[PDB]
Amino acid sequence: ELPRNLEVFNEACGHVFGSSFNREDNSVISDAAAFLFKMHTHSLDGQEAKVLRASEKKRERENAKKSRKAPEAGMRVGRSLILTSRWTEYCATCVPALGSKMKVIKASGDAAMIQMMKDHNSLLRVCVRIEVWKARYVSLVALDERIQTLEDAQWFPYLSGDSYRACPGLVGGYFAKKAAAGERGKNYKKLNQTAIIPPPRFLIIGHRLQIGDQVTLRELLASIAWGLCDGVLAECWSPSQGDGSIGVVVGLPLQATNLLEECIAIQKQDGVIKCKRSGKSLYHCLKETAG
Amino acid sequence: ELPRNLEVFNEACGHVFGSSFNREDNSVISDAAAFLFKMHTHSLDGQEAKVLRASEKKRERENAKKSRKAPEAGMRVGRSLILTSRWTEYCATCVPALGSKMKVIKASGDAAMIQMMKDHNSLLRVCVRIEVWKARYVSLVALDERIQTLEDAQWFPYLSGDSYRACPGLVGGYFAKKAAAGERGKNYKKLNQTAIIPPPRFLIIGHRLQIGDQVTLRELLASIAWGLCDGVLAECWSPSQGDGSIGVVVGLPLQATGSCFLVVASHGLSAIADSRIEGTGNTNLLEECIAIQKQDGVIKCKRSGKSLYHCLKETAG
Amino acid sequence: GSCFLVVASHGLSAIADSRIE
RNA sequence: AAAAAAA
RNA sequence: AAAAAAAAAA
């Protein structure tokens, strides 16, 4: 009884990855979502070429991509995902042809193509959300060299253009800067570096992150923040008996001398509490506590 | 006796410049490297015109260059470099024709042309390294007007596109800004503004800069840093007996172990530029130290917090 | 005219102006 | 080390 | 009760 959005992603992952797709591992789901996003953006080998206004170097790149042999059944994507023979059929039938626009399909009145385009859009949105969460998870232990000043960190995450197009309100990168550093329309979404994105294992099943659900510290920190946010957010997690790298969520931050006195708000089971800021980046705090 | 790059640079400079090429003068080697870089980039008079995607202004400039007479034999290069009558032969022979690409020559299968293309690439790399070192050496006692803020100084040196193409890791400038701002792939190299470059009188010989070599203060400082770096690097030098002008190298700094110490604003908190300096308001950032690898061992030297250009002129008064 | 910048190098921290420090 | 490749 | 949907979409 899941929403069509997550049902589409589940069916697509099943069709493209057979039984090798594990529905409980964050890395596996993130890699599968990345591959599906690439497939639905016409960026794999053997797919159509983006030659509307491409430059000569871009022209050669697209032509080589189109001419290059497409992925074959049995390919290894990531670490534990294996492509099946049905992936070609899905890529042919469910990926809209390059340059397809929703307006044209809607005007044509074809119900099948309209439904296919809606499923494609939902899959793009879900894959972009998973991509953003994985970027936040990666940033906890390995920062990007580009982040050397507060202005540079203001635009995290640094994702591709199509990622921004699908989910403007979560993706940063160059395109977010261009949108902000330029003419703004009414349909303008403001970047939220700390939007709560449930972990992929919870995202693809419709589960909403809340208090009392078992998660890992890195999982929660990537869900509610990223590497360079303050370390006080680590107070939202509490390790379980025996640790074992698995604990439980006890709260979720709100609004997602004196300077160090600033406090964050944590929504606990009883009620909102004010927690003093630590002043140390989550990346630095995790590095220090690693040993 | 020498690697291919150093041997080819020596051969090129000797052939082009006759006996006038002094092998023990940094300025002479810098001038010769600049001239060879101009030659191999077709930026001299009378060479091919770059018109592939040139704008009408660029087309006119290149056409005027082509129509202009090429330099005549015996012309004075810089101060103490004079062209020989046999430089035209080398320019016509060892300079790849405009638009030459390695893949095309590899498809051709001619070993001689492959060797010539590899020689051209190596010569470009060596000349660009020498150009970068001379840029720093100039910056030691002659500030660049284009630099007025830390952001501008972040991309030093400011060199042409060919220099960035040959040695991306050592050359700054507009193309370095363009590469850094855009997507950073696996082939991207971060601009190492203070990467160690042996002086030209060492680079062509291949003698790696190390402790004990007799160098002048300015040339050593250019090798390890540039004009706007900290003055503490002057501690890497020590005058020899009798003062004079040439001393000795006593240490070589290290530029590793660098991490981020920022905390962006979130959930109502306020951004912090640095966690360490925050403390309780004590903005005393003078305890930082630079690691110097000496013969006895590694030591740490407290930063002086003053520009090298300032210190060099001040201590000379 | 002159400048007092000290760019970050060798693990040090950048300075916007030597005098102000 | 090697292999790609202009404001 | 900002969160989710449908219109638009280097």
- DSSP lists the bridge partners of residue B249 as B237
d(CA B215, CA B202): 10
Q: Are residues A26 and A127 in the same domain?
A: yes
Query: CB count, 10 Å around CB of A26?
Result: 21
SS3 track for C1-21: CCCCCECCCCCCCCECCCCCC
For chain B, helix (H) and strand (E) counts, in that order, are: 13, 7
Q: What are phi and psi of A239, to 5 degrees?
A: -65, 150
* CA proximity to A131, closest of A27, A25, A15, A17: A27
Spell out the residues 6+ positions from residue A76 whose beta carbon is closer than 8 angstroms to its own: A82
Pairs of residues, one from chain B and one from chain C, whose beta carbons lie less than 8 Å apart: 72
Is residue A274 within 8 Å of residue A251, measured between CB atoms?
A: no
Count how many Cα atoms sit within 13 Å of the Cα of residue B119 in the half-sphere of its side chain.
20
Is residue B266 within 8 Å of residue A229, measured between CB atoms?
A: yes
Q: Is residue A64 part of a domain?
A: yes
Q: Is residue A195 part of a domain?
A: no
Q: Is residue B37 part of a domain?
A: yes
> Which tokens in the block code for residue C18?
């030597």
* CA proximity to B125, closest of B94, B182, B64, B167: B167
Query: CB count, 10 Å around CB of A164?
Result: 24
Q: Residue-wise over A188-198: b if at least 16 C-beta within 10 A, else e?
A: eeebebbbbbb
* Chain B CB within 8 Å of residue A277 CB: yes
> Which tokens in the block code for residue A238?
């509490």
> Which tokens in the block code for residue B163?
């220099």
d(CA C18, CA C16): 7
Of B264, B272, B281, nearest to A279 by CB-CB distance is: B272
Q: Is residue A52 part of a domain?
A: yes
> Which tokens in the block code for residue C2?
């002159």
Is residue A180 within 8 Å of residue A216, measured between CB atoms?
A: no
d(CA A230, CA B272): 9
CA B213 to chain centre: 20
CA–CA distance from B311 to each of B50, B77, B138, B235, C2 (Å)?
Answer: 44, 33, 15, 12, 13
Count how many Cα atoms sit within 13 Å of the Cα of residue B17 in the half-sphere of its side chain.
27
Amino acid at C12: L
Q: Please name the method used to determine this structure.
A: cryo-EM
* Chain B CB within 8 Å of residue C20 CB: no
CA B236 to chain centre: 20
Q: Are residues A112 and A226 in the same domain?
A: no
Q: Residue-wise over B179-216: b if at least 16 C-beta within 10 A, else e?
A: bbeeeeeeeeeebebbeebbbbbbbbeeeebeeebebb
> Which tokens in the block code for residue B118?
């590899």
Burial degree of A36 (CB within 10 A; 0-12, 13-18, 19+): buried
Q: Are residues A134 and A240 in the same domain?
A: no
* Chain A CB within 8 Å of residue B278 CB: yes
Q: Are residues B113 and B222 in the same domain?
A: no
> From the alpha carbon of B58, which nucleotide's C1' atom is closest?
D7
Q: Is residue A176 part of a domain?
A: no
Strands B248-249 and B237-238: antiparallel
| Last residue in a domain, options B144, B162, B193 | B144
Dihedral sign for Cα B235, B241, B244, B246, please. Answer: negative
| Last residue in a domain, options A105, A122, A142 | A142
> Which tokens in the block code for residue B238?
């020590």
- DSSP lists the bridge partners of residue A272 as A267
Amino acid at B189: K
Do B267 and A255 lie within an 8 Å CB cutoff?
yes
Is residue B298 within 8 Å of residue B291, measured between CB atoms?
A: yes
Query: What H or E segment, with its residue span, contains residue A163?
Result: helix A161-166
Is residue B215 within 8 Å of residue B200, measured between CB atoms?
A: no
Q: Which domain holds residue A16?
A: 4-142
Contacts of B156 in chain C (CB under 8 A): 7
Number of domains comprising chain B: 2
Of B143, B274, B290, nearest to C11 by CB-CB distance is: B290
d(CA A274, CA A263): 6
Q: DSSP string covering B289-309, please?
A: EEEEE-SS-EEEEE---SBHH
- What are the strands, taking DSSP E only, across chain B? 76-77, 81-82, 237-238, 248-249, 252-253, 289-293, 298-302
Q: Are residues B113 and B236 in the same domain?
A: no
Sheet with strand A272-276: strands edge to edge? A252-253, A263-267, A272-276
* CA proximity to A38, closest of A65, A60, A11: A65
Amino acid at B306: K
* CA proximity to B157, closest of B257, B225, B245: B225
> Which tokens in the block code for residue B55?
């704008």
Q: Is residue A73 part of a domain?
A: yes
Q: Are residues A26 and A100 in the same domain?
A: yes
Query: CB count, 10 Å around CB of B245?
Result: 9
Query: What H or E segment, with its residue span, contains residue B153?
Result: helix B150-153
Q: DSSP string covering A219-254, please?
A: HHHHHH--TTSBGGGGGGEEE-TT-TT-EEE--EES
* Chain B CB within 8 Å of residue A80 CB: no
CA B22, B25, B28: angle at the middle one, nearest 5?
Answer: 70
Amino acid at A101: K
Is residue B170 within 8 Å of residue B242, measured between CB atoms?
A: no
- DSSP lists the bridge partners of residue A237 as A249
Helix, strand or coil, per DSSP, at residue B263:
strand
Is residue B250 within 8 Å of residue B237, measured between CB atoms?
A: yes
Amino acid at A74: G
> From the alpha carbon of B5, which nucleotide's C1' atom is closest?
D1
Burial degree of A32 (CB within 10 A; 0-12, 13-18, 19+): buried
Residue recorded with tokens 């349909």: A187
d(CA B89, CA B156): 36
Q: Which residue is nearest to nucleotide D5 (CA to C1')?
A: B165
Helix, strand or coil, per DSSP, at residue B116:
helix
Q: Are residues A125 and A231 in the same domain?
A: no
Q: CA A291 – C1' D7 distance (Å)?
A: 49
> From the alpha carbon of B103, which nucleotide's C1' atom is closest?
D4
Is residue A74 within 8 Å of residue A82, measured between CB atoms?
A: yes
Q: Is the CB of B57 under 7 A from strand D?
A: no
d(CA B239, CA B315): 14
> Which tokens in the block code for residue A19?
């039984």
Is residue A96 within 8 Å of residue A116, measured between CB atoms?
A: yes
> From the alpha carbon of A173, which nucleotide's C1' atom is closest?
E10
CA–CA distance from A286 to each of A232, A289, B262 (Å)?
Answer: 12, 5, 14
* CA proximity to A193, closest of A172, A167, A164, A168: A172
Q: Which residue is nearest to nucleotide E6 (CA to C1')?
A: A118
To one decimal, the resolution in angstroms is 3.4
Distance from CA of B19 to the nearest CA of C (A): 40
Query: What H or E segment, with its residue span, contains residue A47?
Result: none
Burial degree of A121 (CB within 10 A; 0-12, 13-18, 19+): middle
> Which tokens in the block code for residue B200?
């030209």
| Last residue in a domain, options B144, B164, B190 | B144
d(CA A119, CA A122): 5
Helix, strand or coil, per DSSP, at residue A275:
strand
Spell out the residues 6+ positions from residue A106 whose beta carbon is closer than 8 angstroms to its own: A114
SS3 track for A83-145: CCCCHHHHHHHHCCCCCCCHHHHHHHCCHHHHHHHHHHHHHHHHHHHHHHHHHHHHHCCCCCC
Of B225, B274, B286, nearest to C9 by CB-CB distance is: B225
Of B182, B262, B269, nearest to A150 by CB-CB distance is: B262
d(CA A248, CA A214): 4
Q: Is residue A169 part of a domain?
A: no
Residue recorded with tokens 């916007």: C16
CA–CA distance from B143 to each of A290, B39, B138, B146, B222 (Å)?
Answer: 45, 28, 8, 9, 13
Residue B71 is classified by DSSP as P
Amino acid at B258: G
Q: Is residue A130 part of a domain?
A: yes
SS3 track for A171-208: CCHHHHHHHHCCCCCCCCCCCCCCCCCCCHHHHCCCCC
* Residues making up chain C, counted from first to last: 21
Q: What are phi and psi of A76, to 5 degrees?
A: -100, 120
Is residue A203 within 8 Å of residue A133, measured between CB atoms?
A: yes
d(CA B115, CA B48): 22
d(CA B159, CA B130): 12
* Residues making up chain B, counted from first to last: 317
Helix, strand or coil, per DSSP, at residue A72:
coil
Query: CB count, 10 Å around CB of B109?
Result: 8
Amino acid at B303: R
- Name the CA dihedral angle for A54, A57, A61, A62, rounded to a multiple of 10 degrees: 20
